[PDB]
Design a binder for this molecule. Structure first.
Ligand SMILES: [Mg+2]
Ligand SMILES: [Mg+2]
Ligand SMILES: [Zn+2]
Ligand SMILES: [Zn+2]
Lengths: 291, 291
């Protein structure tokens, strides 16, 4: 099994680029190229190794590679934005958000594993916005696909988790992937604002979420924020995401930053102040049309 | 009837801004504000007056105002991108493309009127990309709505056109609005490339389209280009369009510039060389992620 589960000629440059795995400014587009166009597999391996998750949950390296290669293969490369690169970006953003100082020692390794897995499969088999009941049918499909692939030969990365752990993780993953459904945005934001107003921090300045009910609300918002993190990334990266979104948009009052991204990121920023101010500053920069 | 069919307090600044009606860089967002949020009505009046179309086709000023106010009212303000501002922008872009030196004296006043009308109604009553037979059902709906509004009291702006002219214009309008259906993009581009290869210019350097069959192909591509002109506009404007598209996108290989906008604009540029090189230069600037 290759260093990052992927086979590439420029494995040297790939490793160097992946040194920014813990950074919000990671150039995932560069990772995509250097990984032989397998950003998701490379990113998840880099993240898992960084968090020592393979050893913690006894996830066989070859099993992870096989599952990821198969998962990444179920994202449609012809779909401009909702492809494995977006999945890799969301997982990596989730990884950094989880490492926020304000959330230190708040989540268990299982909750962390669930958030990263959810991020990895959250848009799998997306057919494209123009080709997409009324109860998160699409997000439930992403979950179904992400889960079914675990049943393939040598693909069950959770084989060494107890039944109790699998039940917990499955439930959390479902909750987080369903939280990426934009129709749930307004209600999720309301919940987050409530978490902010009733926030409680220790003397060390760390959030206090002793109750699971509160933990899952934060985790849902965290992954939702990761999914909507494009505008908080450096302009060069944001413009590339924007170019992809427009291609998918055209494939066969008003404003994204003002009405969707800002209200959400400002609230998240309040939850972890001062940890996310840099993101708001970047958002503000990207909002300056004439700058 | 007000100077531009719309009632506003800053009519003074509106007139000044509309002095750029013949310019590709027009700040339509500014026009929207200065017109009391009625960009389409203001822009069409400015264009029609500029081309002296009201006198040419005896279009009563009050009739035009009533029709436009009603048409603009059928665009959904809550739809982030596909609203009356996009319609105004496409009509104004069509106006400038038609004035291209290479197309001087090529089209009749009726063909010009049809192209501008088509641009004005081309997306009317659009419900938003996430809320949108297989034969341009949506574009045919835009046409149905645009046409039905002409039947309202004092709304028939074509009342003074002969039956022969109405038949011709109706046919051309249908052809141009259907040409905005992205599923027809590839075939339209093929047609345009054929128009380019078999191009014929006079000694004065003006295109020769003596045959209607060729005229309609160029007109269809012209309005299609107008609909896809966002990336050829100055970055500040492009970023605002992009922000609107992303909001609509999220409302409940790969790349827009590289695979959709460039192949089309390069072909158009060949048709009218050197008239549109500035647009390609701007497109190139907007394609520089790190610039
Ligand atoms: Mg999704
Ligand atoms: Mg349209
Ligand atoms: Zn997503
Ligand atoms: Zn349009």
């Amino acid at each position: 099994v290759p260093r990052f589960g992927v086979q590439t000629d420029q494995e040297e440059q790939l490793a160097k680029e992946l040194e920014d795995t813990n950074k919000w400014g990671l150039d995932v587009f560069k990772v995509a190229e250097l990984s032989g166009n397998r950003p998701l597999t490379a990113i998840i391996f880099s993240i898992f190794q960084e968090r020592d998750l393979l050893k913690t949950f006894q996830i066989p390296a070859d099993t992870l590679a096989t599952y990821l290669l198969m998962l990444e293969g179920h994202y449609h490369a012809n779909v401009a934005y909702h492809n494995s690169l977006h999945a890799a970006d969301v997982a990596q953003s989730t990884h950094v958000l989880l490492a926020t100082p304000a959330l230190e020692a708040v989540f268990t390794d299982l909750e962390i594993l669930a958030a990263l897995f959810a991020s990895a499969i959250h848009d799998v088999d997306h057919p494209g916005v123009s080709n997409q009941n009324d109860a998160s049918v699409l997000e439930n499909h992403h979950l179904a696909v992400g889960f079914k692939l675990l049943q393939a030969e040598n693909c069950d990365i959770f084989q060494n988790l107890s039944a109790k752990q699998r039940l917990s993780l499955r439930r959390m993953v479902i909750d987080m992937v369903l939280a990426t459904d934009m129709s749930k945005h307004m209600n999720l934001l309301a919940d987050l604002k409530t978490m902010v107003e009733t926030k409680k921090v220790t003397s060390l300045g760390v959030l206090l979420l002793d109750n699971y009910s509160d933990r899952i609300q934060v985790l849902q918002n965290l992954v939702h924020c990761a999914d909507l993190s494009n505008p908080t990334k450096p302009l060069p990266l944001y413009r590339q995401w924007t170019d992809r979104i427009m291609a998918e948009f055209f494939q066969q009052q008003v404003g994204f930053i003002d009405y969707i991204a800002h209200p959400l990121w400002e609230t998240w920023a309040d939850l972890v102040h001062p940890d996310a101010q840099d993101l708001l500053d970047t958002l503000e920069d990207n909002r300056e049309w004439y700058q």
